[PDB]
Symmetry: D2
Subunit: 25 residues, 4 copies
């Protein structure tokens, strides 16, 4: 469903932001 | 620099997911 | 080890996308 | 659309596999 898919995409996007923050650290 | 190049590639993937979310709403 | 830990995290994200593709077909 | 979204997800999955191959190299 569009909402389940949307939530998963946002969680993956947040994980990438967090990995990028770790690369910076 | 490998870390800088990986950081940029991950930013591109992050931005692709941001845009997919926008397309799902559109 | 940072590179090994990054490799595993990227594998998890890759697997999440593989499973999302399966859900789209289901 | 489900097919456009699917194609994008697979391209992101392939990019992650390619980044992992580079981490190994």
């Amino acid at each position: 469903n569009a909402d389940e898919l949307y939530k998963e995409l946002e969680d993956l996007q947040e994980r990438l932001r967090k990995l990028r923050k770790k690369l910076r650290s």
